[PDB]
Design a protein around this ligand. Structure first.
Ligand code: MG
Ligand code: MG
Ligand code: MG
Ligand code: MG
Ligand code: MG
Ligand code: MG
Length: 224
RNA sequence: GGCUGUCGUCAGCUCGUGUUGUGAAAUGUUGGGUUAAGUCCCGCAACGAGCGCAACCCUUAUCCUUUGUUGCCAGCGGUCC
């Protein structure tokens, strides 16, 4: 990645100053019309170090869970995780997805079963309205667990867009000792993140930049 | 012991695992709506489950098929009606 690419992507744009987290002071460059400006001179090396560590994780045949559920980030994170053969959560994070994996995997199994019943013709022997009921259940399980249906266990890393919004997932990973790589905007707490990447987590341009880079890095880790 | 009344056929009562709290406990089960209903949808540090709700049972209202006496009499003939 390059500083100029980041800047044209809008990565340097933090939040308004009245909403800052004071712990984000070392990564703030200044203010522009009451809005904090992130120091890309910190962002570039820190992102490059996160990229190298993620490359190593993908090289050990590791699973990376992409987490972003903001409306701006959902489709992009899904595309990024799919294009690099990884796992994602792009709709509401379910409390206990990781710390209560022994329970959530049962819903994943039910997702598998309902998907086969949708490609097995078992839905035809159903009383029409129950076909719609099971379709609703399949669709909701797909909304919430589609991205992790084949994860098969705890991931080896989390890549998070907007640490503040995804605080539950960060907390769960910390509880289970799973390294966290996050875009940490100026309003956010960097304390639960092992690899902090200071930057905008709201605009699609910046989000897509981060995600494309992470997907490419894990692809190179797999290929190498 | 068994059996029964009663709140009350009221919509409630819980649990596992997760998480919160030093703890009693909490969350789930609250919230926005909706329903006869913890009924359902949406949300949501909860994810799920069980007993309850509902359904499955009996009866009643319509129709079809089968059978046709001890029950029936529309069409035919006969009458002691
Ligand atoms: Mg209650
Ligand atoms: Mg309670
Ligand atoms: Mg409510
Ligand atoms: Mg119920
Ligand atoms: Mg609820
Ligand atoms: Mg009942």
């Amino acid at each position: 990645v390059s500083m100029r690419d980041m800047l044209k992507a809008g990565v340097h744009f933090g939040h308004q100053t009245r909403y800052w987290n004071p712990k984000m002071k070392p990564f703030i460059f200044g203010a522009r019309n009451k809005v904090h400006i992130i120091n890309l001179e910190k962002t570039v090396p820190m992102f490059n170090e996160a990229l190298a560590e993620l490359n190593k994780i993908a090289s050990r045949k590791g699973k990376i869970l992409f987490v972003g559920t903001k409306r701006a980030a959902s489709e992009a994170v899904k595309d990024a995780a799919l294009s690099c053969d990884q796992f994602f959560v792009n709709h509401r994070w379910l409390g206990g997805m990781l710390t209560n994996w022994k329970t959530v995997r049962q819903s994943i199994k039910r997702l598998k079963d309902l998907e086969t019943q949708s490609q097995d013709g078992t839905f035809d022997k159903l009383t029409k309205k129950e076909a719609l009921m099971r379709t609703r259940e399949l669709e909701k399980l797909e909304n919430s667990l589609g991205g992790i249906k084949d994860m098969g266990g705890l991931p080896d890393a989390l890549f998070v867009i907007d640490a503040d919004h995804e605080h539950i997932a960060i907390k769960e990973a910390n509880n289970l000792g799973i390294p966290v790589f996050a875009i940490v905007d100026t309003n956010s707490d960097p304390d639960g993140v092992d690899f902090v990447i200071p930057g905008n987590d709201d605009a699609i341009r910046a989000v897509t930049l981060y995600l494309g880079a992470v997907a490419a890095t894990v692809r190179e880790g797999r290929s190498q």
